[PDB]
Amino acid sequence: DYLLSANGSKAIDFVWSNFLKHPYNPKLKQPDANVKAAWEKHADWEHWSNMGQDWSLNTPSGLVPRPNHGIAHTLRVAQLVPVIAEFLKAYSGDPKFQKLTQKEIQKAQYMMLFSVIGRENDMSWTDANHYQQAFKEAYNGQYSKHIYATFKENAQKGFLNHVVTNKSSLIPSLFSDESELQYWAEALDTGISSASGILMALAHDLDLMRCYDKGKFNSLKMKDLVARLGGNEDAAKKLADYAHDLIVATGDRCMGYGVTQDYNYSLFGKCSLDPNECLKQLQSIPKPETT
């Protein structure tokens, strides 16, 4: 809905041109030797190479930077938000989800456009916890700034930059005033009980089927989604099927759910190098109906 609006289109162009079309930062590709050694002692941690994973992807259309957190991912999580809201209203059994007016849902969708702009590598929140702990263990307890939290602070900076540059178009029609804007900017700091926060978290969670294996996606994402939909596994599966179909529509990899696939390099390149083409492919997917 909001992604074709003037405000949506301008936000997409901002995040694409200033952040998402550019490479990750080579200085964040891997830890130093000391941090690596401390990290490797934790056999239960995913390997430190997660920091440099998914750096870029060659496609017939060009070399795609940040392929696992680029324009296709960003547009999909934004597109998921209104559909998730309709599923929550239909199946959650929690009346708190009717605080989701169109304006609320549009703000949540808008925020998702800024949800990965601060990234300088592909590492997860858990990876950043591990880096910070490994740093402490390698360097006599010394403190280091949490890498993922720094990404989110940089995203807040870029979000606020865009919104204030376009304040007359966004306040009060999307954000009522500067105080409300401040609350939504603080909502980018994702590490959650509000209706809009749950909505944004579920969009992030669903799209992780692109990079989680099936055991991890089912245990860490699907169980929670089913419980949020009142235990309705059929409804959760319809919603996950939609997230899967958006992934396939953009040529992206799908590892954790449904009919799995590797990248379609041609389609992924076309979508990942042209936001408007990516959005066109996304909107060709039927939105599921709720009872």
Short mmCIF file of all heavy atoms in Angstrom, two decimals, residues 38 125 144 196 208 285:
data_model
loop_
_atom_site.label_atom_id
_atom_site.label_comp_id
_atom_site.label_asym_id
_atom_site.label_seq_id
_atom_site.Cartn_x
_atom_site.Cartn_y
_atom_site.Cartn_z
N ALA A 38 39.70 -16.64 20.49
CA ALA A 38 38.75 -16.72 21.60
C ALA A 38 37.39 -17.24 21.12
O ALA A 38 36.75 -18.05 21.80
CB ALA A 38 38.60 -15.35 22.26
N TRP A 125 22.73 -10.22 15.20
CA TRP A 125 22.80 -9.74 16.58
C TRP A 125 23.55 -10.73 17.45
O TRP A 125 24.42 -10.34 18.24
CB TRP A 125 21.39 -9.50 17.11
CG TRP A 125 21.31 -9.06 18.55
CD1 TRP A 125 21.52 -7.79 19.03
CD2 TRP A 125 20.97 -9.87 19.69
NE1 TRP A 125 21.35 -7.77 20.40
CE2 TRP A 125 21.01 -9.03 20.82
CE3 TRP A 125 20.65 -11.21 19.86
CZ2 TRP A 125 20.73 -9.49 22.11
CZ3 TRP A 125 20.37 -11.68 21.14
CH2 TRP A 125 20.42 -10.82 22.25
N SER A 144 34.28 -3.45 24.12
CA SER A 144 34.18 -3.05 22.73
C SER A 144 32.73 -2.74 22.42
O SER A 144 31.82 -3.36 22.97
CB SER A 144 34.71 -4.14 21.78
OG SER A 144 33.98 -5.35 21.94
N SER A 196 2.64 -2.63 17.29
CA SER A 196 3.44 -2.30 16.12
C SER A 196 4.83 -2.93 16.19
O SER A 196 5.38 -3.32 15.15
CB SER A 196 3.55 -0.78 15.96
OG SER A 196 2.27 -0.21 15.82
N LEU A 208 13.65 -14.35 7.47
CA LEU A 208 14.83 -15.15 7.79
C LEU A 208 14.80 -16.54 7.20
O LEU A 208 15.82 -17.23 7.24
CB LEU A 208 15.04 -15.22 9.30
CG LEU A 208 15.55 -13.92 9.91
CD1 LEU A 208 15.49 -14.01 11.41
CD2 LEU A 208 16.97 -13.62 9.45
N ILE A 285 2.68 -11.01 -6.52
CA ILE A 285 2.33 -12.17 -5.71
C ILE A 285 1.00 -11.91 -5.00
O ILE A 285 0.87 -10.90 -4.31
CB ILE A 285 3.43 -12.47 -4.69
CG1 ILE A 285 4.75 -12.77 -5.42
CG2 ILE A 285 3.03 -13.61 -3.77
CD1 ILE A 285 4.63 -13.93 -6.40
#
